[PDB]
Amino acid sequence: QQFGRDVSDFTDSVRDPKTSEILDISPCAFGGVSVITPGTNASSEVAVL
Amino acid sequence: AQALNTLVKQLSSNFGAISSVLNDILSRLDPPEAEVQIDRLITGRLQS
Ligand SMILES: *[C@@H]1O[C@H](CO)[C@@H](O[C@@H]2O[C@H](CO)[C@@H](O[C@@H]3O[C@H](CO)[C@@H](O)[C@H](O[C@H]4O[C@H](CO)[C@@H](O)[C@H](O)[C@@H]4O)[C@@H]3O)[C@H](O)[C@H]2NC(C)=O)[C@H](O)[C@H]1NC(C)=O
Ligand SMILES: *[C@@H]1O[C@H](CO)[C@@H](O)[C@H](O)[C@H]1NC(C)=O
C-alpha cells in the first residue's frame, strides 16, 4: 500500500515514505457561523455558535 | 442518502472534460489562460 481513500475520492490514509507509518488525513476546520441576538432594540450584545 | 451519494459522484464526474483534479490542471496546464477551463468546470458543479 501507499495511501488509501475513503468512499469518496479524497485521500484517507497515507504511509510514511521514510518510516512507514500508518497515518490518516482529516480536514482542517470549517463550518457555519451562527449569531444569536436578543434584538437591537432590547440589547446590543451578541453571542456566537 | 441516494441524493447525497449522487452529489458525491458529481465531484468525480469531470465537467470541463480536460482535467480530473484542480491540482492537476494547475500543474499540467499553464496558469495565465487555462483558468478558463476551471470556470467551465466549476459552473457545472455549481448547477449540480
Ligand atoms: C530510511 O532511513 C531511516 C534513517 O534515516 C530509517 O529510519 C530508522 O529506522 C530504524 C528502525 O526502524 C530506527 O532504528 C532504531 O533506532 C533506535 C534508537 O536510535 C535503536 O535503539 C534501534 O535499535 C534496535 O534495532 C536494531 C536493529 O534491529 C538492533 O540492532 C538494536 O539492538 C535494537 O534492537 C533501531 O536501530 C531509526 O531510529 C530510524 N531513524 C530515523 C532517522 O527515522 C528507515 O528505517 C529507513 N527506511 C527504509 C525503507 O530504508
Ligand atoms: C423599542 O423598545 C422600546 C422598549 O422600551 C419600545 O417602547 C419601542 O416601541 C421599541 N421600538 C419599536 C420601533 O418598536
Strands, helices and their partners?
The structure is cut from a larger assembly and holds two copies of chain A.
Chain A: E1 13-15, E2 22-24, E3 35-36, E4 47-48
Antiparallel strand pairs in A: 1-2, 3-4
The structure holds a molecule of 4 linked components (NAG-NAG-BMA-MAN) and 2-acetamido-2-deoxy-beta-D-glucopyranose.
Task: Name some characteristics of this structure.
part of a larger assembly, 2 chains, 49 residues, mainly beta, two-stranded antiparallel sheet, 4 strands, binds a molecule of 4 linked components (NAG-NAG-BMA-MAN)
Structure write-up:
The structure is cut from a larger assembly and holds 2 copies of chain A. Chain A is built from no helices and 4 strands. In chain A, strand 1 and strand 2 (22-24) form a beta hairpin. Chain A is rod-shaped. Chain A has strands at residues 13-15, 22-24, 35-36, 47-48. Helix content of chain A is 0%, strand content 20%. Chain A is mostly beta strands. In chain A, the strands form 2 sheets. Chain A has a two-stranded antiparallel ribbon with strand order 1-2. The first copy, chain A, has a two-stranded antiparallel ribbon with strand order 3-4. Chain A starts with 12 loop residues before the first strand and ends with a strand. The interface between A and B is small, with 3 and 3 residues. The structure holds a molecule of 4 linked components (NAG-NAG-BMA-MAN) and 2-acetamido-2-deoxy-beta-D-glucopyranose. Chain B: This is Spike protein S2'. Chain B: Residues 1-38 form a coiled coil. Chain B: Acts as a viral fusion peptide which is unmasked following S2 cleavage occurring upon virus endocytosis. It is classed as viral protein/hydrolase.
